[PDB]
Nucleic acid binder design. Structure first.
Lengths: 117, 66, 97, 88
RNA sequence: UUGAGUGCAGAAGAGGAGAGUGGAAUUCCAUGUGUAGCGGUGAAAUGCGUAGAUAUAUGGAGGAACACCAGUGGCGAAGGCGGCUCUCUGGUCUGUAACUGACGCUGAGGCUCGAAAGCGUGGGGAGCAAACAGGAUUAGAUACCCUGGUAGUCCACGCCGUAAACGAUGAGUGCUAAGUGUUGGAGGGUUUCCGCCCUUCAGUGCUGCAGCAAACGCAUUAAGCACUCCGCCUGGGGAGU
């Protein structure tokens, strides 16, 4: 509703999950989806297929309210970073600009221990 | 073989000549290593000190990605 | 001998015409009265900034060169009022060689 | 510590003759001045371990020059220590 | 006057102490949007969530470490030192050859410094994490894996005095083929040389000849040739008891 037709889409995908949320430029939340909701489970939610379906189940709803172009936010070193954008461009949207924002510190944090397996 | 930046007999960096200073930052806003831009040995240091002074008084950005 | 100094600082755009002058001369004074040799004052450039500081995006860039002995308190007294003032954003004292 | 002003000024009040920058009297006078100033600095910042070491070295060197001055003449040695006022 | 030292002329540096200051990031807090999950694993579970979570946007708070430059680079006697600016302050190197005239070297007892962990007194506390709790795997698992978490990690002044504190290579000084890079210099030709070429001082790496080595290898930064001063050793356990 209210046909904003101008917003931004965020992407955030770990080694074990993926999410995509689409809001306006500010942006108050509009529509989002994730492989967690789509019925997939655990050992599979990090696959370049879950990205496709999450992207679709989000865009097919978001564009209802009125939306043609969008901006793209890519966090999350993972494996759906590629499928997600193309899959947005597949179901008829206007991915125009692509900026990669990954939080990198200036060395002021202590990461956890290394894992021994 | 890479020509030195200071063929022009420059002496003082002055940390304000931003035109003079843009030769060495990354197109993103980082710093470029000597072996990449082929600079001097004592020139590599004062360059960095200059631009670090500049990055406080706003005459240059910390991050230019947006 | 005596060292050298370049004291550049920022002033907001929302200044008046008189406040600027009174401030500049006031700092000239508190420079002198502690044994400084104020050489000159200038206004570098009406510049914006590559990133905001508090609520601003531009600022006037004034600058003064001064010489004095090392034990001359003409620097501590400066920074003791610059960083507690209001119309001044930042500043940077630097030895000049 | 000191700067060329007093560094050059004193080396003429203990100069044996003109240009006595050797002259184991002058060297120990200068070292006395400098170790006094360094004592002041240490009383100010008493955790600057990396300069108290240099203080020690200077003290030792002055001790050595004094020892040498004594074993070639005595009247010079006594008259100087009465001139500089040291040697508990 | 050659060793040592001082004068005069220059050069580099994450050498040290004190005083302020900057941005990025993680986290807690305030508010707008927003709907059912988030997070975790080899697989799962514990856990937080419909008292509205994750996400997302704006601002605030607080402590800590300093992205890129970063380099077999630099400095320090060793432990070690990397955001920026200021006040105090040590040491090293090249040139000149004013000046004193062997003032040197090493150095039992003594004194000083001395990573991390640890103790005391008073602060501070964001992340991380011994102990501890819960969840898992296992015949058993008071362990490895996961979710939490206390001292500690930081600051001031005291204390202790130990590491594979390592190049497992004490210190001073002189002599004995080469080649190759690199930090800081001083000279000479070409010269726009500030972009080449030649000579030399000081560190710093790799290859390699005599010689040495039980072999492995080392070789102007000797583990070669030699003098001076110090420390230490004499089968393995018992025991640094």
């Amino acid at each position: 509703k209210k046909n904003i037709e101008s917003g931004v889409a965020h992407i955030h995908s770990t080694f074990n999950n993926t999410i995509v949320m689409i809001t306006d430029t500010h942006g108050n939340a509009l529509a989002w989806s994730s492989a967690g909701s789509l019925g997939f489970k655990g050992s599979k939610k990090s696959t370049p297929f879950a990205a496709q379906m999450a992207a679709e189940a989000a865009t097919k709803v978001a564009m209802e309210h009125g939306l043609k172009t969008v901006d793209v936010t890519v966090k999350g070193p993972g494996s759906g970073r590629e499928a997600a954008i193309r899959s947005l461009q597949a179901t008829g949207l206007e991915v125009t600009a692509i900026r990669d924002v990954t939080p990198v510190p200036h060395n002021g944090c202590r990461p956890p221990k290394r894992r021994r397996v | 073989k890479v020509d030195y930046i200071a063929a022009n007999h420059i002496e003082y960096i002055d940390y304000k000549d931003t035109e003079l200073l843009k030769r060495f930052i990354s197109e993103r806003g980082k710093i470029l290593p000597r072996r990449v831009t082929g600079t001097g040995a004592k020139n590599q240091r004062k360059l960095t000190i200059a631009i670090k002074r500049a990055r406080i008084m706003g005459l240059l950005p910390f991050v230019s990605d947006e | 001998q005596d060292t050298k100094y370049e004291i550049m600082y920022i002033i907001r755009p929302n200044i008046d015409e008189e406040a600027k002058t009174a401030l500049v001369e006031r700092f000239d004074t508190i420079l002198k009265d502690n044994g400084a040799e104020v050489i000159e004052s200038k206004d570098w450039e009406k510049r914006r900034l590559a990133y905001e500081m508090n609520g601003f995006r531009e600022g006037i860039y004034h600058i003064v060169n001064v010489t004095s002995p090392s034990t001359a308190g003409a620097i501590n007294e400066f920074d003791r009022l610059a960083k507690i003032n209001d119309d001044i954003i930042r500043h940077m004292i630097v030895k000049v060689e | 510590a000191i700067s060329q002003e007093r560094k050059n000024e004193i080396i003429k009040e203990y100069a044996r003759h003109e240009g006595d920058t050797g002259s184991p009297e002058v060297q120990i006078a200068v070292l006395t001045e400098d170790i006094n100033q360094l004592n002041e600095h240490a009383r100010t910042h008493k955790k600057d371990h990396h300069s108290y070491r240099g203080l020690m070295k200077k003290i030792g060197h002055r001790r050595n020059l004094l020892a040498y001055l004594r074993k070639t003449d005595i009247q010079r040695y006594r008259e100087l220590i009465q001139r500089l006022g040291l040697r508990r």
